[PDB]
């Protein structure tokens, strides 16, 4: 037999982030005694291929791992999918080897049943992957089935079906049934609390945690997975989990301890939110400040801790822990002002709001108060948006004095969120629904309920593919937002004509400190074609900390960078 497993990192976005689940997975499957390597084509994407013939001829694995991070860019102007770049990548690997498949992600468990179908690939994991993977990697290695793995997505001949999970939750002392789609589940089972994940750097077939960092990458750090609000454009309740899965303290503040004995000083914190579940986060805060005064040699006292966070709960406590930690900056998600905005949108799982613009008021005043940095995030264009509902936030956002104010337009709707959901429900699979859009759409989007699908695949599916498997990316604009739909026009200039719309809202003496959707032709608008010269001078300077940490003085980093290439 073989104990070899393969992870792949097909992400091929630069500027480039650290594949940080296969860091998970790796020191799962090595715990339970498997030879573990990893093949990051972040760093090969003009000779990725290469790089896979090279690899297959020399080795063997019993079982191969792909992450999918990212469906598409998210950006509902954009509407730029990733997946089919995914699955050339799959398709050369199951051209290289007969060894099976699996699939998984954070992107990915946004509609896993769909993309194992579509990748043609073997099994595929929803949620957390390390424990899942070991039950995996062990019943191939074994060459026993694998029907009976609790959660695992196996791709029958018919479609994807699902193995239930072994632990249900439990409503008037009966067990809930699994759904066959998986969706909403707390996934804590799946969630290894208790190792610390291992980072390394510069080692062969491993995560390259330092060379991420030398190119931008921020050193990730989880402390607990999964979400148990429910908010309505939001993936992650799904796709994480709707239960906190906490770490361990000691053995998340020894990672973080581990990345920055290596240099990787800055540190984002990768929850969903760091500061719900608030009791685990300020007991993390205050190991981190015990660790830092006990020893000045502990390299935690060079951290710079980069958090995001929902606008409550957020207290002076714990702003003095976050300031006596190292913490740099916050980025809150406070996404509007008006209640008839947010109520159905940034909600708990009762439906319920949970803040108040006093709220993001008093967070950005008190990391003001400790020299904390601020980025405070709008969106725009959910239901209920006009463009006097637009004014009134961006009023009130800009007003805030934020270090940054970061604006976003439109919504890419997915299977599992309530949006997604309601929208799926206004169509009833007969008709469309009012600010449903795709720019590839040939005519009406008319979408189907999952209790109207013949699987989970086809739920999923609709979201990203039209009826004839061209891509379709759904997404959602409030018609409040669009002119008179009587005038014809191109999708894509609707959507420029939304982002115009927005710019000019913003007077010119502020674009310093905020951060706009563009399209071709707009002000700093980034492509695909040129070099960011932003971002080639933040490395070749060596600038640390998030990238939104320097945007105030882009124009000045760019001159000195100039100025040190000619010195
Ligand atoms: C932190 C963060 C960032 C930071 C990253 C900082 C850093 N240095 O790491 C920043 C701001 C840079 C960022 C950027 C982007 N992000 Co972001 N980000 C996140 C966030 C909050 C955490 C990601 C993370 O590291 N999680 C912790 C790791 C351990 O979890 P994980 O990757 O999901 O891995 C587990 C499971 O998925 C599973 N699994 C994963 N791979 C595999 C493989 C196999 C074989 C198996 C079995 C299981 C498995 O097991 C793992 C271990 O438990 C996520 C949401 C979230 N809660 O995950 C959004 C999220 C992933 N990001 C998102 C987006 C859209 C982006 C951008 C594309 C935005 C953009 N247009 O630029 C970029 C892409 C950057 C890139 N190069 O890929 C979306 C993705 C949505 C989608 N449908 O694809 C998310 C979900 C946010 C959202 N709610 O929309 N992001
Ligand atoms: S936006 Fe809402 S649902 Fe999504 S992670 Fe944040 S709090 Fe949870």
């Known amino acids: 037999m073989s104990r070899l497993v393969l992870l792949v990192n097909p992400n091929k976005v630069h500027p480039p982030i650290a594949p940080y689940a296969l860091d998970v997975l790796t020191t799962a499957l090595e715990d339970e005694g498997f030879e573990v390597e990893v093949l990051d084509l972040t760093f090969r994407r003009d000779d990725w291929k290469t790089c896979l013939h090279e690899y297959f001829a020399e080795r063997s694995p019993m079982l191969v791992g792909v992450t999918v991070?990212?469906?598409?860019?998210?950006?509902?102007?954009?509407?730029?999918?990733?997946?089919?770049?995914?699955?050339?990548?799959?398709?050369?690997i199951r051209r290289l080897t007969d060894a099976p498949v699996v699939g998984g992600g954070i992107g990915f468990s946004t509609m896993p049943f769909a993309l194992v179908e579509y990748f043609g690939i073997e099994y595929g994991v929803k949620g957390p992957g390390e424990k899942i993977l070991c039950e995996l990697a062990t019943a191939i290695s074994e060459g026993r089935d694998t029907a009976g793995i609790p959660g695992l997505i196996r791709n029958t001949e018919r479609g994807a079906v699902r193995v239930p999970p072994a632990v249900l939750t439990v409503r008037h002392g009966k067990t809930q049934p699994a759904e066959p789609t998986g969706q909403f589940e707390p996934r804590v089972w799946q969630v290894d609390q208790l190792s610390v994940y291992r980072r390394r750097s510069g080692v062969p077939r491993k995560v390259d945690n330092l060379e991420y960092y030398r190119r931008g990458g921020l050193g990730s750090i989880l402390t607990k997975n999964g979400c148990a609000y429910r908010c309505s454009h939001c993936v992650e309740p799904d796709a994480k989990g709707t239960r906190y899965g906490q770490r361990e303290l000691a053995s998340v503040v020894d990672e973080m301890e581990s990345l920055a004995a290596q240099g990787i000083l800055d540190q984002h914190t990768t929850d969903s939110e760091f500061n719900l579940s608030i009791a685990h986060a300020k007991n993390l805060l205050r190991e981190i400040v015990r660790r830092r005064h006990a020893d000045p040699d502990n390299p935690l006292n060079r951290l710079r801790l980069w958090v995001y966070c929902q606008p409550s709960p957020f207290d002076e406590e714990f702003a003095d822990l976050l300031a006596a930690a190292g913490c740099r900056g916050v980025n809150v998600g406070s996404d509007h002002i008006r209640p008839e905005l947010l109520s159905g949108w940034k909600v708990t799982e009762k439906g319920g709001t949970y803040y108040t613009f006093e709220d993001t008021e008093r967070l950005v005043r008190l990391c003001r108060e400790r020299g904390i940095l601020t980025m405070v995030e709008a969106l725009f264009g959910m239901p209920g948006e006009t463009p006097e509902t637009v004014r009134a936030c961006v009023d009130a956002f800009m007003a805030l004095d934020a270090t940054v104010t970061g604006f976003s337009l439109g919504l890419r709707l997915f299977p599992y969120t309530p949006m997604g959901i309601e929208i799926a429900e206004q169509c009833a699979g007969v008709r469309t629904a009012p600010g449903l859009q795709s720019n590839t759409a040939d005519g009406p989007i008319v979408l189907k309920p999952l209790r109207m699908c013949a699987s989970p695949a086809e739920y999923e599916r609709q979201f990203m593919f039209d009826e004839h498997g061209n891509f379709r990316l759904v997404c959602y604009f409030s018609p409040g937002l669009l002119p008179d739909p009587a005038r014809a026009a191109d999708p894509e200039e609707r959507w420029h004509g939304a982002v115009a719309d927005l710019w000019a809202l913003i007077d010119p003496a502020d674009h310093h400190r905020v951060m706009l959707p563009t399209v071709e032709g707009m002000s700093e608008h980034?492509?695909?074609?040129?070099?960011?010269?932003?971002?080639?001078?933040?490395?070749?300077?060596?600038?640390?900390?998030?990238?939104?940490?320097?945007?105030?003085?882009?124009?000045?980093?760019?001159?000195?960078?100039?100025?040190?290439?000619?010195?």
Request: hydrophobic fraction near 35%; glycine fraction near 10%.
């Open 526 to 567: 980034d492509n695909n074609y040129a070099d960011n010269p932003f971002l080639t001078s933040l490395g070749g300077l060596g600038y640390t900390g998030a990238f939104w940490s320097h945007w105030r003085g882009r124009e000045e980093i760019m001159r000195k960078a100039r100025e040190a290439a000619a010195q």
């Open 69 to 92: 991070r990212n469906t598409d860019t998210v950006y509902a102007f954009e509407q730029r999918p990733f997946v089919g770049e995914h699955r050339e990548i799959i398709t050369e």
